[PDB]
Write a protein that binds this ligand. Structure first.
Ligand SMILES: Nc1ncnc2c1ncn2[C@@H]1O[C@H](COP(=O)(O)OP(=O)(O)O)[C@@H](O)[C@H]1O
Ligand SMILES: Nc1ncnc2c1ncn2[C@@H]1O[C@H](COP(=O)(O)OP(=O)(O)O)[C@@H](O)[C@H]1O
Ligand SMILES: Nc1ncnc2c1ncn2[C@@H]1O[C@H](COP(=O)(O)OP(=O)(O)O)[C@@H](O)[C@H]1O
Lengths: 371, 371, 371
């Protein structure tokens, strides 16, 4: 039968059926709970909203993401997320549909262990599997080599791969992503008079970040331009009107990606860790990687980030190589398409984890060679 | 069985049975007492009049409202009011009908405590409840969101509500209502040479305020008109003839609702407190409220107050949000109709306060979440 | 010559000369304007009262604080505040006296820029500087590490500092302070029959909040005590007699500091934000902070807030660390003493901003490395 693919992720869960060309269901991976008393009794005020319902009801809710940085901290909210997914978005019973789940590399083992435990016991899936998001993003691009830089909402990582073989000893993971960038935007939108403190308006700052922010090709010259001229200011109307104006922030914010020291982290930027992960690899297979830099995730949607990344990585790397960057136009959902392709394959039929073998060997089956 | 819905309020008590479409009884919430000696014995002259008979006998009585500003200051007179209500207007025994009671928010807890105690012990009701007048007014309007502005005789308040959840921290109460407007009208009718000092004549000024007063859509141009022309003066016959004529007053009086500085108050006007109450709520629910202003109470009956309220609240609000004001034609009794609706519901049946549980826990039951 | 130290703040402005041991001038940072017409001509009624004369004339004024939450919204009134300060409290000319200005962190740049512009142009100072209130409070305490929790009238913040270096990314700001607590006290003093609505009566409620309120070391047991016993009620005579009595409120009010959800705010309490700010700093330097949790500001004057703070923060923190809380008896003016010390130093001489530099580089000099 048809296999299911579920990309839990942070910020946005995206689920659908294998073999398709786009994910059928996408909605925010948030959970809401009311925070006022309620006086008009009988209106069916459910004690928990999920996904887009909470997104629409925010004004009376307190939003709580259940996956912080690739790791799950609340398993009740995550169970509710999965149940709402299956029974409202896909409207399919998991009784006969094997699912494909994803996680960031170097994650705690308990996360995937309990994920499989729950998927087998509570939802009773006939089979399942757990892949690494970067390999899925690569399979989506129809290659077999190339360093990949998946950067979503919680985590950022590099997985250098060659001919289908991934080098785990050079995986570099950075815990700076779109969420820390939204936090920095909320930090620096206060030097213009505006304030955002509620978790219902962190979503608003997130929308502003998506709409108006871009990347500076030369951060110093662009900062000087913002200082002298004023062409960069762009307006934005909050959901009650009172249009705001932001200037320097539009590129001051995602510059944190290239200099994490802005928000108090000691680590290096995106391009530096990329070049490092390359230099950790064998001296024979670095040119293929320089040629096949693959970008994915939602945070790599920034206008012009490709040119900036290329300039920085050419500044760092030698000058006699050819530095390419694969930034497809639909890169955001590349992980889901890669998962769908990996599922719809014919060689994959012995990679699943059947419920028989799960009951026979427990939740430690994923760390076993049946990955 | 059928439940009673008693909306005490100031100025006019309105009682009746649940499930109906209008209150069965409405009469002035006054208590009269004779103030002369009487010489024709054998009449059986009562020792205290109440309600409509007091209104009819004013010329020999001294009228005394027992609820001043949402709070009850005389409990003997309010006991008499409730007794006369039940045994003469509705002619029903409270021994077999649970009743519903209302009050303005931010009232002293003693008021509702003693209301509950008296309704339980003295009248021996089988059950009861105490609702907030604004939420009942919203019930009658057939919504589940929308800031409401109830304006009765002694109290005026705003309760912003969203999906049945009301925000208690953005409630704004004002102690300027129809009674202070009657006092102002009595004050300014003394420049036209007319005098009113008695409590039997405050009723006359009240009838004048109801029949002739209106709201100035543009106060400055309307004052200029009242200076230049004379087209506005509408006559009025006092109960002994001697027709009076009033000019500027017809709109000079209810402007106090928009500028309390006329009578020495420091708080803002109706529209500014509404806008403030809106600005205290979350930034994501403001547009629904702007769209769903609800009005109630008798003081929102002034001809033209809706257009004036809309103009002011638009001048204060942003220029992109659409501002509505839901002023039904029967808005005056929205509180009672909403109370009847709340009573005749099916989920409301376990929300009462039983005499058993009351005798078990005392009058402090209402402060308990059994509200 | 001697350097001037001016601490604007909300609630109380405190100015004086460097090197002293107490501020020479403290008066309420209010501005009062008359609100009645006046009939006795020739009495020389000025057109705007300022400071303590406004406090003494309140009964005929409308008070208007010009600094709401660390930010200034009326610059005319603040200009008048500074003028009155220099020419009546200190009676000194700013023509040769460099001054020291303070502000809460994460403030809009416009407030500071215009403060600098006005101090240079209008008052014509020879030099000036703008420091952060928390670092001043720290310098007053003779340390160089330890996080500080300054909590005045309009703003509350945390600044983790280590060996003179302050971590900017772990600063936590909260917009809940003494003013919101006075608002809550005015909110809950209405469930006892008393009403306070005028802006001249907010001062009275403020004095009540200062004299009678305290913190409950165990809120639930204290609420139970207030329910059962009555030993807690303390009387208070309003300026015309009619002594009031308050019970539960005495500790119900400053509990908002530990649960902002009481007044509709979503952020966490004092102790939670403190612990978060600690968990945001490096792992190797948390013990010094736990050991040196400095307090300051006027809102930390509440009787017993230290024991409650320590109990809560130990409940949140690990159990093997020593959790001290430095709370000097004179912390209320620690910011001004710290400013006086900073000025009285010998290394601070090249940190000012001379009028030459300002006329050469404009008001944007404060954002420049000459801070
Ligand atoms: N056009 C855009 N510009 C900038 N940021 C974006 C854009 N689109 C999405 N994002 C960011 O990407 C994040 C979503 O991450 P996502 O790719 O869903 O993670 P995952 O792939 O692990 O589910 C959001 O938090 C959002 O801030
Ligand atoms: N058509 C009208 N025009 C002006 N004022 C009115 C009108 N109808 C009622 N009022 C005023 O409304 C008041 C009655 O308030 P009401 O709505 O009965 O308060 P509650 O509902 O709390 O009892 C009266 O004092 C009267 O002055
Ligand atoms: N003993 C006290 N008890 C309770 N509150 C106090 C006490 N002393 C001062 N306050 C509060 O502190 C506030 C003054 O804050 P302050 O420290 O002057 O701020 P700033 O230093 O920024 O001017 C006042 O509003 C008052 O309510």
């Amino acid at each position: 039968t048809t296999a299911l693919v579920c990309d839990n992720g942070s910020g946005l869960v995206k689920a659908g059926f294998a073999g398709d060309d786009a994910p059928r269901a996408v909605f925010p991976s948030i959970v809401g709970r009311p925070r006022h008393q309620g006086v008009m009794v009988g209106m069916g005020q459910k004690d928990s909203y999920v996904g887009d319902e909470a997104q629409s009801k925010r004004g009376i809710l307190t939003l709580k993401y259940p996956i912080e940085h690739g790791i799950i901290t609340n398993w009740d909210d995550m169970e509710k997320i999965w149940h709402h997914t299956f029974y409202n978005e896909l409207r399919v019973a998991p009784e006969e549909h094997p699912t494909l789940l994803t996680e960031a590399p170097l994650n705690p083992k308990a996360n995937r262990e309990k994920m499989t435990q729950i998927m087998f016991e509570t939802f009773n899936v006939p089979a399942m599997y757990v892949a690494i998001q970067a390999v899925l993003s690569l399979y989506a691009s129809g290659r077999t080599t190339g360093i990949v830089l998946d950067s979503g909402d919680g985590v950022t990582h590099n997985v250098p791969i060659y001919e289908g073989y991934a080098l785990p000893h050079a995986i570099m993971r950075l815990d700076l992503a779109g969420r820390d960038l939204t936090d920095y935007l909320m930090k620096i939108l206060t030097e213009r008079g505006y304030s955002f403190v509620t978790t219902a308006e962190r979503e608003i700052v997130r929308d502003i970040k998506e709409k108006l922010c871009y990347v500076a090709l030369d951060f110093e010259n662009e900062m000087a331009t913002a200082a002298s001229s004023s062409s960069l200011e762009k307006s934005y109307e909050l959901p009650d009107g009172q249009v705001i104006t932001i200037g320097n922030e539009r590129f001051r914010c995602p510059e944190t990606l290239f200099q994490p020291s802005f928000i108090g982290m000691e680590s290096a930027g995106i391009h530096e860790t990329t070049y490092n992960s390359i230099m950790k690899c064998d001296i024979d297979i670095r040119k293929d990687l320089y040629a096949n830099n693959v970008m994915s995730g939602g945070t790599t949607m920034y206008p012009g980030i490709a040119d900036r990344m290329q300039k920085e990585i050419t500044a760092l790397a030698p000058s006699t190589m050819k530095i390419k960057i694969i930034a497809p136009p639909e890169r955001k959902y590349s992980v889901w398409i890669g998962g769908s392709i990996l599922a719809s394959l014919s060689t994959f039929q012995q990679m699943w984890i059947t419920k028989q073998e799960y009951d026979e060997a427990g939740p430690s089956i994923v760390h076993r060679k049946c990955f």
